[PDB]
């Protein structure tokens, strides 16, 4: 069960808790597997562009 790919703790859960917690922790980028500080700020900068674009749409 590869969703959620950012958390192998959640991905190996065999229950429906895997789906709910994958949704709830998806934007908690600091707690994801393999996250570094530099890749966090780079992901945020681009995510903020996407949120800006939603405001203009």
């Amino acid at each position: 069960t590869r969703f959620p790919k950012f958390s192998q703790d959640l991905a190996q859960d065999p229950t429906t808790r895997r789906i709910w917690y994958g949704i709830a922790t998806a934007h908690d980028f600091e707690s994801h597997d393999g996250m570094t500080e530099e890749s966090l700020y780079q992901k945020l900068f681009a995510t903020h562009f996407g949120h800006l674009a939603i405001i203009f749409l």
């Binding site: 992901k43 681009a46 995510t47 562009f49 996407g50 674009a53 749409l57």
Partner: peptide
């Protein structure tokens, strides 16, 4: 008024924003 040509133009602009959103959302994942 917003003529039928202008609705069609707006969907073409929206399609280009759609593929741009598609580029960003796959680069984010």
């Amino acid at each position: 008024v917003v003529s039928g040509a202008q609705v069609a133009i707006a969907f073409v602009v929206a399609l280009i924003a759609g593929i741009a959103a598609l580029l960003l959302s796959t680069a984010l994942g």
